Design an enzyme around this catalytic site. Structure first.
Site, PDB file in Angstrom:
ATOM      1  N   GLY D  10      -8.926  48.693  34.693  1.00  0.00           N
ATOM      2  CA  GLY D  10      -9.582  49.966  34.899  1.00  0.00           C
ATOM      3  C   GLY D  10     -10.868  49.848  35.701  1.00  0.00           C
ATOM      4  O   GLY D  10     -11.373  48.761  35.989  1.00  0.00           O
ATOM      5  N   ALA D  12     -13.955  50.580  34.848  1.00  0.00           N
ATOM      6  CA  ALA D  12     -14.989  49.884  34.090  1.00  0.00           C
ATOM      7  C   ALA D  12     -14.751  48.379  34.104  1.00  0.00           C
ATOM      8  O   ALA D  12     -15.654  47.598  34.421  1.00  0.00           O
ATOM      9  CB  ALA D  12     -15.037  50.411  32.656  1.00  0.00           C
ATOM     10  N   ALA D  99      -4.560  57.357  35.781  1.00  0.00           N
ATOM     11  CA  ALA D  99      -4.008  57.889  34.542  1.00  0.00           C
ATOM     12  C   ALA D  99      -4.679  59.176  34.079  1.00  0.00           C
ATOM     13  O   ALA D  99      -4.351  59.671  32.994  1.00  0.00           O
ATOM     14  CB  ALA D  99      -4.093  56.833  33.431  1.00  0.00           C
ATOM     15  N   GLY D 144      -8.157  56.168  30.973  1.00  0.00           N
ATOM     16  CA  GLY D 144      -6.733  56.169  30.683  1.00  0.00           C
ATOM     17  C   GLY D 144      -6.056  54.855  31.022  1.00  0.00           C
ATOM     18  O   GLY D 144      -5.044  54.494  30.414  1.00  0.00           O
ATOM     19  N   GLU D 183     -12.122  60.882  25.636  1.00  0.00           N
ATOM     20  CA  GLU D 183     -12.281  59.462  25.353  1.00  0.00           C
ATOM     21  C   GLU D 183     -12.210  59.122  23.863  1.00  0.00           C
ATOM     22  O   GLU D 183     -11.724  58.023  23.542  1.00  0.00           O
ATOM     23  CB  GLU D 183     -13.593  58.961  25.964  1.00  0.00           C
ATOM     24  CG  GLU D 183     -13.575  58.897  27.474  1.00  0.00           C
ATOM     25  CD  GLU D 183     -14.899  58.440  28.043  1.00  0.00           C
ATOM     26  OE1 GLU D 183     -15.753  59.310  28.314  1.00  0.00           O
ATOM     27  OE2 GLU D 183     -15.096  57.214  28.202  1.00  0.00           O
ATOM     28  N   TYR D 224     -24.206  52.698  37.582  1.00  0.00           N
ATOM     29  CA  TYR D 224     -23.245  51.726  37.068  1.00  0.00           C
ATOM     30  C   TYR D 224     -23.659  50.302  37.413  1.00  0.00           C
ATOM     31  O   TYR D 224     -23.452  49.376  36.622  1.00  0.00           O
ATOM     32  CB  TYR D 224     -21.846  52.025  37.613  1.00  0.00           C
ATOM     33  CG  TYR D 224     -21.110  53.101  36.850  1.00  0.00           C
ATOM     34  CD1 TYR D 224     -21.229  53.199  35.471  1.00  0.00           C
ATOM     35  CD2 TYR D 224     -20.307  54.023  37.505  1.00  0.00           C
ATOM     36  CE1 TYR D 224     -20.564  54.184  34.764  1.00  0.00           C
ATOM     37  CE2 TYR D 224     -19.640  55.012  36.811  1.00  0.00           C
ATOM     38  CZ  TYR D 224     -19.771  55.089  35.438  1.00  0.00           C
ATOM     39  OH  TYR D 224     -19.109  56.071  34.734  1.00  0.00           O
ATOM     40  N   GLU D 254     -12.702  28.600  19.080  1.00  0.00           N
ATOM     41  CA  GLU D 254     -13.928  28.474  18.303  1.00  0.00           C
ATOM     42  C   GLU D 254     -14.656  29.802  18.122  1.00  0.00           C
ATOM     43  O   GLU D 254     -15.624  29.854  17.356  1.00  0.00           O
ATOM     44  CB  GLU D 254     -14.852  27.449  18.967  1.00  0.00           C
ATOM     45  CG  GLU D 254     -15.964  26.922  18.074  1.00  0.00           C
ATOM     46  CD  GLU D 254     -16.414  25.523  18.472  1.00  0.00           C
ATOM     47  OE1 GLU D 254     -15.836  24.967  19.432  1.00  0.00           O
ATOM     48  OE2 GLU D 254     -17.340  24.980  17.822  1.00  0.00           O
TER      49      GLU D 254
HETATM   50  N1  GTP Z   1     -20.654  49.971  31.541  1.00  0.00           N
HETATM   51  C1  GTP Z   1     -19.824  50.531  32.418  1.00  0.00           C
HETATM   52  N2  GTP Z   1     -19.013  51.572  32.019  1.00  0.00           N
HETATM   53  C2  GTP Z   1     -18.162  52.153  32.895  1.00  0.00           C
HETATM   54  C3  GTP Z   1     -18.090  51.712  34.205  1.00  0.00           C
HETATM   55  N3  GTP Z   1     -17.164  52.471  34.840  1.00  0.00           N
HETATM   56  C4  GTP Z   1     -16.656  53.370  33.965  1.00  0.00           C
HETATM   57  N4  GTP Z   1     -17.277  53.190  32.760  1.00  0.00           N
HETATM   58  C5  GTP Z   1     -17.022  53.923  31.512  1.00  0.00           C
HETATM   59  O1  GTP Z   1     -15.629  54.035  31.349  1.00  0.00           O
HETATM   60  C6  GTP Z   1     -15.282  55.269  30.767  1.00  0.00           C
HETATM   61  C7  GTP Z   1     -14.099  55.859  31.530  1.00  0.00           C
HETATM   62  O2  GTP Z   1     -13.133  54.856  31.768  1.00  0.00           O
HETATM   63  P1  GTP Z   1     -12.749  54.337  33.250  1.00  0.00           P
HETATM   64  O3  GTP Z   1     -12.925  52.840  33.383  1.00  0.00           O
HETATM   65  O4  GTP Z   1     -13.547  55.063  34.314  1.00  0.00           O
HETATM   66  O5  GTP Z   1     -11.198  54.763  33.361  1.00  0.00           O
HETATM   67  P2  GTP Z   1     -10.075  53.816  34.023  1.00  0.00           P
HETATM   68  O6  GTP Z   1      -9.921  52.517  33.270  1.00  0.00           O
HETATM   69  O7  GTP Z   1     -10.406  53.594  35.480  1.00  0.00           O
HETATM   70  O8  GTP Z   1      -8.697  54.643  33.862  1.00  0.00           O
HETATM   71  P3  GTP Z   1      -8.379  56.030  34.627  1.00  0.00           P
HETATM   72  O9  GTP Z   1      -8.481  57.187  33.657  1.00  0.00           O
HETATM   73  O10 GTP Z   1      -6.965  55.951  35.154  1.00  0.00           O
HETATM   74  O11 GTP Z   1      -9.369  56.201  35.753  1.00  0.00           O
HETATM   75  C8  GTP Z   1     -16.509  56.157  30.843  1.00  0.00           C
HETATM   76  O12 GTP Z   1     -16.931  56.451  29.533  1.00  0.00           O
HETATM   77  C9  GTP Z   1     -17.569  55.335  31.542  1.00  0.00           C
HETATM   78  O13 GTP Z   1     -18.776  55.393  30.824  1.00  0.00           O
HETATM   79  C10 GTP Z   1     -18.906  50.661  34.619  1.00  0.00           C
HETATM   80  O14 GTP Z   1     -18.861  50.247  35.778  1.00  0.00           O
HETATM   81  N5  GTP Z   1     -19.772  50.075  33.719  1.00  0.00           N
END
Ligand code: GTP
Ligand code: ACP
Ligand code: GDP
Ligand code: CA
Ligand code: CA
Ligand code: CA
Ligand code: MG
Ligand code: MG
Ligand code: MG
Lengths: 54, 423, 352, 438
Positions: D10, D12, D99, D144, D183, D224, D254
């Site tokens: 994803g 994140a 997603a 997602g 979420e 971010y 471990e």
């Molecule tokens: N710490 C941190 N959180 C992130 C980052 N990018 C997204 N998030 C968190 O991720 C959550 C949303 O999930 P995403 O990672 O954007 O969704 P995805 O895994 O790309 O899946 P999709 O719905 O298909 O886009 C949000 O609550 C954001 O706060 C990041 O670069 N760093």
């Protein structure tokens, strides 16, 4: 306040300190859960076209 | 490469779709000939969402113009940005729709629908990945209402898993063309309830009061009303057209908690009258944007409750100052927001302001107050249908009174659905 | 416009604070489940602290200190005094107490008998009192057989401590009594003592030769108004306030309430609250806490102050609801959410 | 020497992976082109950094990582970013539409099509490992993909890599940096199907990272990048043992032995200090006792909770910098006498300590200041269940009215999987309370 397992090397060291002593699903069942969801998507899209044919 | 296919149907549909392209073409640096003369890369970043890149660096709007009489589309092709539209994308008849839903959906429109779809399939077969469709149209007329909803019913059949987005202009006796607009609107509302994911409701009555009261325009025209729809369509599509942390489906997943409740109330700010040069602060943008006198639904939100709210802020401003003010309206009137959906108010900033504005804000509300809209329509409907007034215009096109009774019951259910979720 | 919620309809204290907040035109009340709130008037049992301090932009305040139950539970207070070096088992102001679990469930049964046999061998007064938190159920007896046999008849934890066989009595009447002081602690952990206390007195002559009739031994406001036959004779509602009691101490014993009793009360409060500060302080926490306490004290014939129990959800005397509550708004709520004296408290400075 | 494969799922997961692998290279002295002057064995070696990096005959050091996203917008930055030469194209897998923040979409609709492609791209890395330890999976709860596709990936990894271990680096949803209303649904859905498949999971609450950036770094609106640069510092301090010579946390096995006595309760709380703003004139360097003591302040915990009102099950001190064992014990004694540390009666009251002499590496032009000594404390407290309560509550507010359920049912998922996952979380909240409260 004991220190045990003190291991040291060039890049650092590590030890342990004791203050007080004490007192899955197979590959067949996953394909079934995935195909079962796809079957419910195919059935739903069927009722959608059936309704669009009406 | 997440592309959106645009479709504009009918008189009202095309005149609004026209300015919407004029407005965004300006913000994206596109001239009336499809050439780019901008200064920032932000403009061309998400450009392919609404534009197709031809040869020589030409950007051709991915839009289909539909109507059953040539009149209105002749104007577009001779209008300012008329040359920008693809010549083939002009699909029109000649008999006209006579402000008759029946004609747009069953008889005249049915003769032209298969050809408009042949163009739809053409633009999609080039999209690397199609987000979905957006349609601009009115619900009180004959083509955009009767034929537009016929297109949606058919697009959902060929593209059953793509998003169907619409901007629907609701009719209002205060800005009325013909007495049968309630008939046409009640019939289309049922199609939208069943076959669209998002519908931005735009009450012509709201636009009138805004031009008359807030904007201080003595005699409003359909031209003044469309200026608003342009500014509003430009805003709601900012999430899609510029870089920001949002596609069509994600918007629906986060806005529509229940299938049939997907009609939104847009809102704009500022709404100044020509004291037009006064710099506008962030508090003022927010106090206006939530004010009922800045919304386009003619619905008092203090009469209903919000399910989900989205807000987009445009311009070079303080994102820390935006947060502090949005978080203030919520905590000062939490009685008008549902308490069973956490964080149901989101905010997105944008650095590129609309043309001629230091900073603006657009409002997207999924409020239960929208039932007051479907209530008026259902009242004007029954007042006529209880005497069968003007039914012959429709029964002559092949319809029956049963189909009218069903659309009546179809919308009353929509009102009860918005009622149980208001308690 | 500040917002608050109400999750304890049975609290007589904070039912008035809510009425006062709304009377300022700047505090709006919300449903008992709406998370967007500036102030929480939480429930007694199972208050969800973990859900406070996570709403962006809102500075949330709660009216209970998480962990204060260590001080407001019969068995908790005992274990805290004997384990905390700040208090020690040789604490001079807390009666010799032992925790006793009923034999159908650590347990200080044998240590109680040891100190019990030592007293029975030394001729010294050996009158004890049994009690528990789930009571409304107290047995005063000089026999260890009756106390231990009484706890086994229950199904919850109890406590046995030394019954003051030489309690100070008021005259005329030859009657027992207790002292209730109210203490408010704000987010900054300032310890304010409400200048006004109350004596919940007994209307029956104290009889040390009959612990069976508990009307002349217990000073609960509900027992005297039910089992006593002199309710409301010498004072109104068996409640004497600091003006009349400070006058009686002067005409009889030639001393002041400030010196003979109050200095001891102010010290006990400091030592108790200072003890648990590093465990309940919200100084570096994402939310802020403040709680009202009600300490009960005993006074022996030697004018020594003994500590009975601490109430975390206490009530107040009828005549002092107005002044105190407003003081809560001044130093506990408006100290965090300002509005657009002669403090009615007595600050007890200390070392945080 | 045993290899570790990292998987980033994803948006994140990928961006946080970007900030971690950026840091791994600076720590091991690996240029963007993949060259490593300090390494003397050209094209081979079983050193400590070779648990995360493999070598080519051309002297290149390539991370043992896989990036997967159902939308190609975020991974495309990596292909043309500063470290485009680090990875080869097979390591970066991208779909065409994501997603839509729909767990059911990432798990069922889209997942089925791309799951096999991922495993193959993974199996290719595994075939280079002479003794694969396990996997480090970075993802989010809200997305997602991070939520829906991860749980499916874990289910398959437990099939194609039975005895191997799997650690998580999850991102807890925080409304201050999120525009997703569902979420809570995704979090509680993914935790349910992933639980029995993750041996140990480190949760980072975006709310916690957000404040640490505004309160310590004086950033009014963190991006971010600010959040990920900080998160990779913690991740670096948690993986440093696997990449440097040492004796504590030498392999993934471990991490459970030292942190997870009971299986389902595999969520250690993390704490980091110091976080000092580089834009400062100059900060008085904190001692060992001072930075250790800060490990018990709520202000710098990766999840906002209250350990004082829980019970500890295990505890590790990972120091980095100018620290010796004598100062560690000195500071520990002082803290026990002042702090509230209540252990469980079936676990010894003690700390495993690890000291790595290399101080935390500073990302050029980052937000953090170069400190002479830093520490990360991994503590398994029942106090972290507070996070589960918050989330479980919101899930109850929406599911009561079945709001948003149709989106998940429409992707093939059954409505009963909601209440099932929920009852599992209700069980996980009960197991936490059975261990802490009296
Ligand atoms: N710490 C941190 N959180 C992130 C980052 N990018 C997204 N998030 C968190 O991720 C959550 C949303 O999930 P995403 O990672 O954007 O969704 P995805 O895994 O790309 O899946 P999709 O719905 O298909 O886009 C949000 O609550 C954001 O706060 C990041 O670069 N760093
Ligand atoms: N060791 C002792 N010696 C003398 N009297 C004692 C005593 N322990 C308790 N008492 C009497 O019992 C009363 C306090 O009882 P306790 O406080 O334990 O019950 P309770 O908590 O239900 C009353 P409250 O409303 O103050 O909470 C006092 O009035 C006191 O006179
Ligand atoms: N906002 C707006 N509404 C319009 C415009 N033109 C027509 N309408 C409304 O649309 C309804 C008539 O629909 P019409 O556009 O004639 O539909 P058609 O038959 O498809 O052309 C009336 O209720 C009008 O109020 C316009 O330019 N702007
Ligand atoms: Ca014809
Ligand atoms: Ca090598
Ligand atoms: Ca396993
Ligand atoms: Mg017309
Ligand atoms: Mg009590
Ligand atoms: Mg994504």
């Amino acid at each position: 306040m004991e220190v045990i397992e003190l291991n040291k090397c060039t890049s650092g060291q590590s030890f342990e300190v004791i203050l007080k002593p004490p007192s899955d699903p197979s590959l067949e069942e996953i394909q079934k859960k995935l195909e079962a969801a796809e079957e419910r998507r195919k059935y739903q899209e069927a009722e959608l076209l059936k309704h669009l044919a009406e | 490469m997440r592309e959106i296919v645009h479709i504009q149907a009918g008189q009202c549909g095309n005149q609004i779709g026209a300015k919407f392209w004029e407005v965004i073409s300006d913000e994206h640096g596109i001239d009336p000939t499809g050439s780019y003369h901008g200064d920032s890369d932000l403009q061309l970043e998400r450009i392919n969402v609404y534009y197709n890149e031809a040869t020589g660096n030409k950007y051709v709007p991915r839009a289909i113009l539909v109507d059953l009489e040539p009149g209105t589309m002749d104007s577009v092709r001779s209008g300012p940005f008329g040359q920008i539209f693809r010549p083939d994308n002009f699909v029109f008849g000649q008999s006209g729709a006579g402000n008759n839903w029946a004609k747009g959906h069953y008889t005249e429109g049915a003769e032209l629908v298969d050809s408009v779809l042949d163009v739809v399939r053409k633009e999609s077969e080039s999209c690397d990945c199609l987000q979905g469709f957006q349609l601009t149209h009115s619900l009180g007329g004959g083509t955009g209402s009767g034929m537009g909803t016929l297109l949606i019913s058919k697009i959902r059949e060929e593209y059953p898993d793509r998003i169907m987005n619409t901007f629907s202009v609701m009719p209002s006796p205060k800005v009325s063309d013909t007495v049968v607009e309630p008939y046409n609107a009640t019939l289309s509302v049922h199609q939208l309830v069943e076959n669209t994911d998002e519908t931005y409701c735009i009450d012509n009555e709201a636009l009138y009061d805004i031009c008359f009261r807030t904007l201080k325009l003595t005699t409003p025209t359909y031209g003044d009303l469309n200026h608003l729809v342009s500014a509003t369509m430009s805003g709601v599509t900012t999430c899609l057209r510029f870089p920001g942390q949002a596609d069509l489906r994600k918007l629906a997943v986060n806005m529509v908690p229940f299938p049939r409740l997907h009609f939104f109330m847009p809102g704009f700010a500022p709404l100044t009258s020509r004291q037009q040069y006064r710099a506008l602060t962030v508090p003022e943008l927010t106090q206006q944007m939530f004010d009922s006198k800045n919304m386009m639904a003619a619905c008092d939100p203090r009469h209903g409750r919000y399910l989900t709210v989205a807000a987009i802020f445009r311009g070079r401003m303080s994102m820390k100052e935006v947060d502090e003010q949005m978080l203030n309206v919520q905590n000062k009137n939490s009685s008008y927001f549902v308490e069973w959906i956490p964080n149901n108010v989101k905010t997105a900033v944008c650095d590129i302001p609309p043309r001629g504005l230091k900073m603006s804000a657009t409002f997207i509300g999924n409020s239960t107050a929208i039932q007051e809209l479907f209530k008026r329509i259902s009242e004007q409907f029954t007042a006529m249908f209880r005497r069968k007034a003007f039914l012959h215009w429709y029964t002559g096109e092949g319809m029956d009174e049963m189909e009218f009774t069903e659309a009546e019951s179809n919308m009353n259910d929509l009102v009860s659905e918005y009622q149980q979720y208001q308690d | 416009m500040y917002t608050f919620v109400v999750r304890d309809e049975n609290s007589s204290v904070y039912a008035e604070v809510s009425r006062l907040l709304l009377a300022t035109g700047q505090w709006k009340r919300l449903r008992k489940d709406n998370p967007r709130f500036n102030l929480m008037l939480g429930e007694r049992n199972r208050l969800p602290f973990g859900r406070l301090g996570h709403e962006p932009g809102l500075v949330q305040l709660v009216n209970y200190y998480r962990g204060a139950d260590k001080l407001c539970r019969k068995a908790s207070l005992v274990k805290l005094i004997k384990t905390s070096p700040e208090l020690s088992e040789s604490c001079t102001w807390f009666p010799e107490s032992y925790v006793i679990y009923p034999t159908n469930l650590t347990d200080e049964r044998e240590v109680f008998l040891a100190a019990y046999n030592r007293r029975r061998e030394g001729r010294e007064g050996n009158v004890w009192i049994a009690k528990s938190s789930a009571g409304a159920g107290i047995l005063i007896s000089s026999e260890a057989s009756e106390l231990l046999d009484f706890i086994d008849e229950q199904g919850q934890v109890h406590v046995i401590q030394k019954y003051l066989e030489k309690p100070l009595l008021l005259e005329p009447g030859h009657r027992k009594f207790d002292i209730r002081s109210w203490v408010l602690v704000d987010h900054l952990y300032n310890i304010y003592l409400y200048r006004e206390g109350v004596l919940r007195t007994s209307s029956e002559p104290y009889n040390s030769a009959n612990f069976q009739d508990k009307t002349c031994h217990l000073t609960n406001h509900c027992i005297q108004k039910e089992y006593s036959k002199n309710y409301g004779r010498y004072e109104e509602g068996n409640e004497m306030f600091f003006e009349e009691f400070n006058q009686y101490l002067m005409d009889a014993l030639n001393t002041t309430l400030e010196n003979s009793i109050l200095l001891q009360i102010k010290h006990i409060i400091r030592s108790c609250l200072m003890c648990i500060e590093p465990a309940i302080s919200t100084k570096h926490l994402h939310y802020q806490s403040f709680q009202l306490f009600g300490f009960d004290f005993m006074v022996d014939e030697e004018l020594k102050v003994w500590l009975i129990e601490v109430n975390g959800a206490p009530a107040c005397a009828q005549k002092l609801y107005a002044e105190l509550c407003q003081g809560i708004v001044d130093v506990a709520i408006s100290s965090v959410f300002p509005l657009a004296p002669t403090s009615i408290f007595i600050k007890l400075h200390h070392h945080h | 020497m045993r290899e570790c494969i990292s998987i980033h799922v994803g948006q994140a997961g990928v961006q946080i992976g970007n900030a971690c692998w950026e840091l791994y290279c600076l720590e091991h002295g690996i240029q963007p082109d993949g060259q490593m002057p300090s390494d003397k064995t050209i094209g081979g070696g079983d050193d400590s950094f070779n648990t995360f990096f493999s070598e080519t005959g051309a002297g290149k050091h390539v991370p043992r990582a896989v990036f997967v996203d159902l939308e190609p917008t975020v991974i495309d930055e990596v292909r043309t970013g500063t470290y485009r030469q680090l990875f080869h194209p097979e390591q970066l897998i991208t779909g065409k539409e994501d997603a839509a923040n729909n767990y059911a979409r990432g798990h069922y609709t889209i997942g089925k099509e791309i799951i096999d492609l991922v495993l193959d791209r993974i199996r290719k890395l595994a075939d280079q490992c002479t003794g694969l330890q396990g996997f480090l999976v970075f993802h989010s709860f809200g997305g997602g993909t991070g939520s829906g596709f991860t749980s499916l990936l874990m289910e398959r990894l437990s099939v194609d890599y039975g005895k191997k271990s799997k650690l998580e680096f999850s991102i807890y949803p925080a409304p201050q940096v999120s525009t997703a209303v569902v979420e809570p649904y995704n979090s509680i859905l993914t935790t349910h199907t992933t639980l029995e498949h993750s041996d140990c999971a480190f949760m980072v609450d975006n709310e916690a990272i957000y404040d640490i950036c505004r309160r310590n770094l004086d950033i009014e609106r963190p991006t971010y990048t600010n959040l990920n640069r900080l998160i990779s510092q913690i991740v670096s301090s948690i993986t440093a043992s696997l990449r440097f010579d040492g004796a504590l946390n030498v392999d993934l096995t471990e991490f459970q032995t030292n942190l997870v006595p009971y299986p389902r309760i595999h969520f250690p709380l993390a704490t980091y200090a110091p976080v000092i703003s580089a834009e400062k004139a100059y900060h008085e360097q904190l001692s060992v006792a001072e930075i250790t003591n800060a490990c018990f302040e709520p202000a710098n915990q990766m999840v906002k909770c209250d350990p004082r009102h829980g019970k500890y099950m295990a505890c590790c001190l990972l120091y980095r910098g100018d620290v010796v064992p004598k100062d560690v014990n000195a500071a520990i004694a002082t803290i026990k006498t002042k702090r509230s540390i209540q252990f469980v009666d079936w676990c010894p009251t003690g700390f495993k300590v690890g000291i790595n002499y290399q101080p935390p590496t500073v990302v050029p032009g980052g937000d953090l200041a170069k400190v002479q000594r830093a520490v990360c404390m991994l503590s398994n407290t029942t106090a972290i269940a507070e996070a589960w309560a918050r989330l479980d509550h919101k899930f109850d507010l929406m599911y009561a009215k079945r709001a948003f359920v149709h989106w998940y049912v429409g992707e093939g998922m059954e409505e009963g999987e909601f209440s099932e996952a929920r009852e599992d979380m209700a069980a996980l909240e009960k197991d936490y309370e059975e261990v802490g409260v009296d």
